[PDB]
Amino acid sequence: MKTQVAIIGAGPSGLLLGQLLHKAGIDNVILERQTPDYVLGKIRAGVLEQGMVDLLREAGVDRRMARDGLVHEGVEIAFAGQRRRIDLKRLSGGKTVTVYGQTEVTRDLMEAREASGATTVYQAAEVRLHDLQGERPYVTFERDGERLRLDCDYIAGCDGFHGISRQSIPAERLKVFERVYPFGWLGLLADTPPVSHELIYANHPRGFALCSQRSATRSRYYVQVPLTEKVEDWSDERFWTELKARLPAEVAEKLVTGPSLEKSIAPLRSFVVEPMQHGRLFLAGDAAHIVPPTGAKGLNLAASDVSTLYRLLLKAYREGRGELLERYSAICLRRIWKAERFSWWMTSVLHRFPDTDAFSQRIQQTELEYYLGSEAGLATIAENYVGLPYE
């Protein structure tokens, strides 16, 4: 078989890129290692930037989102017995964020692809990439025990952190910047009304806590936990008791608890690779970089990488301007480093780090007080939170 753009991974990055390209008349094939169900089992993201919201509209897959998504104009940070609200809308110049689960976004895209008739091969095992520097790269894989070959012009590695893509670039050609945090986030999804109409990020001595949501009758809560914790050691009961202990009393008493639909621990890490391409292979999303979930930037950076790659592929095909693709990494890396810096800051001011001296704790507290009390400080948080402009 042959196609124009081969896409590895049917997560949100691959599906979004695939939908935009298909709509523009550029044929693409998506190869996914798992089943549709496995992909749909991941909860993950809840917060979307305006840029991603507009990109979903452009790919023509925003109906259900426009209907069920919740537009948020502010967020709240609780620390030292205070609850400060950041008016995102006012401080960012009118921008807001949208709460719509990653599971929903993925399901919408999967249905849009299914209807369009574009090629998607699930359970594509043993994917291997070949002749990345040639004019005719190709992908081989196994489906039903038989190894097939797929010829293409370009390959988009949208296979996440553990994908085959990044591993296929000669190690010596990439420079990795990584930071692993000494804690993870224990998340819990419950079919209960959220405790607030807006999100609440809490810095508490016992550790970080976050009150989020998916809809009016579905909530998503998180609490910082050491990397040594096992999810099986956290009953719903223990989770609720601990969450309550980390929130403002008035917030804790309004909390409606209930049995979990999902519970899991996500370890935190920062990771960037430079460059993000090699010959005819272009990395996008988690395949290229990881941000701690604190700043809600992961899926959002995937969106901007995808928007950038899509627009460069359009010029290559439609206008024969293939040279432009050389600029992919430079363009993406500028936005990536700024979102990484913001996610890093958010993570450092809201979490409890092991072995912190008295001076560091006071500075951490002072960072919150300064930034949440200054009009200029608030603006730096808001403009970064809503998402910096696409280049």
Ligand X SMILES: Cc1cc2nc3c(=O)[nH]c(=O)nc-3n(C[C@H](O)[C@H](O)[C@H](O)COP(=O)(O)OP(=O)(O)OC[C@H]3O[C@@H](n4cnc5c(N)ncnc54)[C@H](O)[C@@H]3O)c2cc1C
Structure-token pair, residue 275: 């460059």
Considering the candidates 95, 204, 297, 351, report the single residue annotated as catalytic.
Answer: 297
Confirm whether 338 is a catalytic residue: no
Structure-token pair, residue 301: 């950076």
Is there a contact between 41 and 30 (Cβ–Cβ < 8 Å)? no
Which range of residues in 12-20, 53-61, 126-134, 336-344 is near a second copy by CB under 8 A?
Answer: 336-344
Torsion angle, CA of 116/25/32/178, rounded to 10 degrees? -130
Confirm whether 72 is a catalytic residue: yes
- Of 153, 166, 198, whose CA–CA distance to 28 is shortest? 153
| Opening angle at CA 120, ends 45 and 8, nearest 5 | 60
Residue 348 sits in the site that holds a second copy (CB under 8 A): no
Confirm whether 385 is a catalytic residue: yes
Confirm whether 293 is a catalytic residue: yes
| Opening angle at CA 123, ends 122 and 125, nearest 5 | 130
Which of 55, 59, 110, 127 forms a contact with ligand X (CB under 6 A)? 127
Which range of residues in 6-14, 185-193, 243-251, 365-373 is near a second copy by CB under 8 A?
Answer: 365-373
Residue 158 sits in the site that holds ligand X (CB under 6 A): yes
- Of 15, 48, 31, whose CA–CA distance to 115 is shortest? 15
DSSP 276: S
Residue 8 sits in the site that holds ligand X (CB under 6 A): yes
Which range of residues in 26-34, 68-76, 313-321, 333-341 is near ligand X by CB under 6 A?
Answer: 26-34
DSSP bridge pairs for 312: none
Contacts of 185 (CB under 8 A, 6+ apart): 208, 210, 222, 223, 224, 225, 265, 266, 268, 293
Question: Total binding residues for a second copy by CB under 8 A?
Answer: 29
Which of 341, 352, 353, 390 forms a contact with a second copy (CB under 8 A)? 341
Residue 358 sits in the site that holds a second copy (CB under 8 A): yes
Confirm whether 289 is a catalytic residue: no
Give catalytic residue positions. 72, 201, 293, 297, 385
Q: Which residues bind a second copy (CB under 8 A)?
A: 175-179, 270, 272, 337-338, 340-341, 344, 357-360, 362-363, 365-367, 369-370, 374, 376-377, 379-380, 383
Q: Which residues bind ligand X (CB under 6 A)?
A: 8-14, 31-34, 39, 44-47, 102, 124, 127, 158-160, 162-164, 185, 187, 266, 285-286, 293, 296-300, 302
